């Protein structure tokens, strides 16, 4: 493709920063799904999801952002929200249609990310929306295989034993 303009770079920054007023000014049908070419090809939505910019996420979803957009590793925004623990964001994405069992290039799901990163409430959320805890990544590992021993709440959750 033809790359980014300065205005596109300004939009990616505003999305990561939570500068919602700037995002409103810069987001066009042509820019809303631009990619961060010099990073890992994150879209505005990837950034806003990863950095917990809930107002930005809301705006982007309402103005044509692609919930399914893949970064260089095949991560979709829901992966980013789950990795970094951002529950409201994850819920928003799921409400708009995010695929809860989506796999990146390494067959990691959002539940693998949440498990590995010790995010109990995210794991519970994903489970409440149909996440399959038996899915194996390219290493043969389930989400449970990625849970630290100190996260016994998550271990119980994924075994079937949580309140």
């Amino acid at each position: 493709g033809s790359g980014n303009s300065e205005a596109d770079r300004q939009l990616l920054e505003a999305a990561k920063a939570g500068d919602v007023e700037t995002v409103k000014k810069l987001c066009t049908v042509q820019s809303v799904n631009c990619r961060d070419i010099e990073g890992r090809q994150s879209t505005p939505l990837h950034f806003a999801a990863g950095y917990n910019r809930v107002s930005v996420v809301e705006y982007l979803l309402q103005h044509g952002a692609d919930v399914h957009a893949k970064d260089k590793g095949g991560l979709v925004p829901l992966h980013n929200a789950c990795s970094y623990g951002h529950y409201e964001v994850a819920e928003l994405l799921v409400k708009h249609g995010a695929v809860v069992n989506v796999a990146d290039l390494w067959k990691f799901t959002p539940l693998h990310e949440a498990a590995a990163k010790g995010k109990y409430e995210i794991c519970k959320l994903l489970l409440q929306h149909g996440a399959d805890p038996t899915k194996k990544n390219r290493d043969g590992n389930t989400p449970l295989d990625l849970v630290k021993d100190g996260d016994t709440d998550i271990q119980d959750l994924l075994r079937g034993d949580a309140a």
């Binding site: 990073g39 890992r40 917990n52 590793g73 990795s83 990691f108």
Partner: peptide, 8 residues
């Protein structure tokens, strides 16, 4: 496997 963008 490289990290997605974000913080938390």
């Amino acid at each position: 496997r490289e990290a997605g963008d974000g913080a938390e």
